[PDB]
From Swiss-Prot:
Domain description: The STAS domain mediates dimerization, with both STAS domains latched onto each other in a domain-swapped manner. The N-terminus domain is involved in dimerization such that each N-terminus domain embraces both STAS domains. The STAS domain harbors a unique anion-binding site important for the fine regulation of the high-frequency electromotile properties. The transmembrane domain consists of 14 transmembrane segments organized a 7(+)7 inverted repeat architecture that can be divided into two main helix bundles, the ''core'' domain and the ''gate'' domain.
Further comment found in the protein's record: The anion-binding site that controls electromotility and associated charge movement in mammalian corresponds to the central binding site of the anion translocation pathway in non-mammalian.
Domain of life the protein comes from: Eukaryota
Induction entry: Up-regulated in cochlea by thyroid hormone T3, perhaps acting via thyroid hormone receptor (at protein level).
Region of interest: Extended region for STAS domain: 1-129
Subunit structure: Homodimer. Interacts (via STAS domain) with CALM; this interaction is calcium-dependent and the STAS domain interacts with only one lobe of CALM which is an elongated conformation. Interacts with MYH1.
Family affiliation: Belongs to the SLC26A/SulP transporter (TC 2.A.53) family.
Tissue specificity note: Specifically expressed in outer hair cells of cochleae (at protein level). Not detected in other cells of the organ of Corti.
Entry's localization field: Lateral cell membrane
Role this protein plays: Voltage-sensitive motor protein that drives outer hair cell (OHC) electromotility (eM) and participates in sound amplification in the hearing organ. Converts changes in the transmembrane electric potential into mechanical displacements resulting in the coupling of its expansion to movement of a charged voltage sensor across the lipid membrane. The nature of the voltage sensor is not completely clear, and two models compete.
Native organism taxonomy: Eukaryota, Metazoa, Chordata, Craniata, Vertebrata
Designated name of the protein: Prestin
Amino acid sequence: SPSYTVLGQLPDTDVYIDIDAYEEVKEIPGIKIFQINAPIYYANSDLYNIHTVILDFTQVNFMDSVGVKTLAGIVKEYGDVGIYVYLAGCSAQVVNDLTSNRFFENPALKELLFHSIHDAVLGSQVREA
Ligand SMILES: [Cl-]
Ligand SMILES: [Cl-]
């Protein structure tokens, strides 16, 4: 798909890349890592034993209201079955867009933000169930 890319980990590193870019790259059991390559409502359309979903926002330069609403729905619906959706690599601007569109109306959602994919992976290691 062009709207998202499944990422895996280069073994024994904090390097995460396209699962298809190199043979030894492997997904992490219990975690799904998706790189957003288009506005999330496009990638979400494709979405339509995992404990964590990590969304890599490194390619995202801004978000619009529809996208934030879509993301809020993804986070809520996964959360309602105990699955955490983490946001990795959001720029200051993207976080401003999330905030402006009231994504953090519940300030607890701030806890879903991580600087890097690896940080997000480590964040999932131990947490309130
Ligand atoms: Cl968006
Ligand atoms: Cl990263």
